[PDB]
Amino acid sequence: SRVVFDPSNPTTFSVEAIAAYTPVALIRLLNASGPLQPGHRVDIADARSIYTVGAAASAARARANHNANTIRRTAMFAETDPMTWLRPTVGLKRTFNPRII
């Protein structure tokens, strides 16, 4: 379901499963305003937070799906050197190709 009239049920699993193209098209066709009266949409901050967390979840799912052909991400710094008295550990600066080939 991709109807803003009753978005109580299609909030997380519906967004994670289907792509963001349909909600993007719905938002584009519905300008920059939406009816906050129908459904469980109190004010606009809650709706904005729901939309942002749904977009973040969809992006994370897409990244996880596409990670099969890519390499796992790494942090800018290591912060994994408990042996400070023995020797320090330098950071990581990824400059190689993110793709396999």
Add this chain to the structure above:
Amino acid sequence: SRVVFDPSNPTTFSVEAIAAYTPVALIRLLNASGPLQPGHRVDIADARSIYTVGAAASAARARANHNANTIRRTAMFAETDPMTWLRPTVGLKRTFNPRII
């Protein structure tokens, strides 16, 4: 002889036997140390020195094993003998990709 609690057993015995990459990864993944009271945690300089000696020995052994294309070596200084009335072969040192040997 691979207990991370005491930094004296995995110093050279577990490093010079095989490639040091696996012990290094195990040490990195097994934190640094635990209870330092029941053990020989004093005088860490000797432990560091013996660990570095073992690492150097393992690296030298690996280099000798992998140096199948470079076994003949000579000196660089000339006129080391009274019988230097002729000019020997000049050639070149190990400053090229291994193609012939």
Add this chain to the structure above:
Amino acid sequence: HHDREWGILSKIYYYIVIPAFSRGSCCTMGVRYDRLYPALQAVIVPEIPADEEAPTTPEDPRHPLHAHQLVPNSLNVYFHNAHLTVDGDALLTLQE
């Protein structure tokens, strides 16, 4: 061997424009050899078969340390950060 001419030349080279250009940046530097020795002491490299050509740039997919055996570690990330023509024969000379 001959004289203090080497020291005289060194002091002349270090006392012409170097203090003027480093008035605000000259300071003593410490030596943490006891702490930095184990970081570079452990150096390993897979065997490279002969009758081949050594890679020029460290970006080809055929590099043994880039295809599937990179791993973070400490020496590996250090080499990734400062791998300016340090592999191959340079790595062999460093190991020697």
